[PDB]
Design a protein around this ligand. Sequence first.
Ligand SMILES: [Fe+3]
Ligand SMILES: [Fe+3]
Length: 689
Amino acid sequence: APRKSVRWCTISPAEAAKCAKFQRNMKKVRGPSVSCIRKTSSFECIQAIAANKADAVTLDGGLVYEAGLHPYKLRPVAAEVYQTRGKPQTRYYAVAVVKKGSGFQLNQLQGVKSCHTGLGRSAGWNIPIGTLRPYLNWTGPPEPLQKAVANFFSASCVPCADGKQYPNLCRLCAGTEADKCACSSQEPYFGYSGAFKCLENGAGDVAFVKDSTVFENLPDEAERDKYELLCPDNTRKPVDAFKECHLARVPSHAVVARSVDGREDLIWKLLHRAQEEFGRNKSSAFQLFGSTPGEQDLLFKDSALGFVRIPSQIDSGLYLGANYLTATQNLRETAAEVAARRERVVWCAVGPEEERKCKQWSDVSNRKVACASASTTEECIALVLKGEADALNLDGGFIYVAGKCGLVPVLAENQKSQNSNAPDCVHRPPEGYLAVAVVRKSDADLTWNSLSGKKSCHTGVGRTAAWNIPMGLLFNQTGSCKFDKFFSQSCAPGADPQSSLCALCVGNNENENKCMPNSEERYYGYTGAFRCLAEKAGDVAFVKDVTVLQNTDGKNSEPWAKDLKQEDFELLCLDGTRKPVAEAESCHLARAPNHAVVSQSDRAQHLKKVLFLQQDQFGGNGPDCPGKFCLFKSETKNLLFNDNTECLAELQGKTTYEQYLGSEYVTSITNLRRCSSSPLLEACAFLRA
Ligand SMILES: [Fe+3]
Ligand SMILES: [Fe+3]
């Protein structure tokens, strides 16, 4: 029944003391118990935590990064909320503070004395240094970055810096004998406030700190006017102009915990109790976000408003985001490596077969396109959000998830439409496809209204033509969110492996990976869903009209298809009627949006360019199409793109997911969520908040 205490790791005597005061006032409040371990630096608590010596530590975005690295694999449990001068935020701006009448601009720091919050931190290191890499004249990774910074600045205070090999990096630090340059508040020049005093005491000429730092130390506007900010456009703006004059906007500090057995619940209960009891003016007996004057930011960021629980899927990579990850990873990669990445396009293939095809595409493109892979579509989208992949073609259904996560539709799939297949395609207005409900003509007893208790074959959960459209219509007539109970048994890759929805799925050939939402599952997709109906594993298949047309009448000669005939199949019309597969225009459940390639709005324009070239060479009229590679063909397996894609067209203005998918379908997808939500969709609610 009983649950133990959160062991909090401290990095200095001042911090231990604060922690003890915290543990003490916590038990006096008859609230969750705390304990305080004692290590000498945040890097040490990362280590202490991963080895189960401790359980929690607040870390700056930059150390979150290091903490998540492989040997430790820690994850951000709770994110601090801050000032903002307006709306509280889980982000902040890194800025460069200098005194007035110093003269230099951002591009003239060579030879300046500089004060840093500490080695590895967002505003004090990762951000300023990545901004000045271009003036560092640094080989790249082989040669230690500290050797570069040490040669650029005349002397500095970068706590946690190697003062033995690079003493210029520790030179400005005031600290006693071995206190000097310490990676804790022992070194008076450590932290936002430390880097500030190092500036204000004339030890350094520029301070790399947070946007609040100046105001936290100079409560009087008259004092602040003796200071300015170095804007990345080589101008100097007042300290209150950080919104315009910052080197970057980084994610807030965060309480990190082990990925496995980290006791996130214990940690959250503790922190939730702490804000309520000792946060913003709650108490007077103890203030959580307040520290002694000698040393600031003890255990937590002084004057933070509180914390927000970080959902569970979120790891450090997603917590930090592409923009931050890239810049951090960039300080550990060569110039040739960084530029290489920026010029290629990394596609995210879902499952084993798409990856092979992607491999072909990479080799055949001379590496303009490289690949990244994952077992499911959500995983790929996360990859796009971490910045490890650049794009992927998605179904209307996942364009929604993608759009809720801030990704935008770049170009759309235009199936070999029919009017005039001249160069109309790239500018032909995308026209969608009809989602249909297919059944064997044989089973004539079956009508839309007798689906209850029947068996179902679905392309996948989350997908338009299958899932979203039928389930949307059904939820309207049954009023029930019990989706696994309408159809007696079903195959809907992506569902709970032990629920009826995964009952008719077959996995790969040796029957493994049953229900996986990727090609391994033979019943996955439009093709698989139709097959499920054909091999009589299910009674109704939710696919698009064309799927039948492409696998009957021998067009698909795979054994199971080979002998099929479009006559053996009929469609279920919403009005209880039944029309041949050809009458779909008057017998469909809906008109869906074509799949679309998505990426960060950031990479969209490049992505477009590489894609117009790639498809001009291997597309529908690709000269090297039959010859060396066809981007839109894959033997009826619809890998990477649908096999009937004529080309990837323009959006006709529909550049946001809402515009693209349209109002109705976006709404319809929202009603369904009343029943079920996804972990990615939530991780993103937090991140894009
Ligand atoms: Fe920071
Ligand atoms: Fe679809």
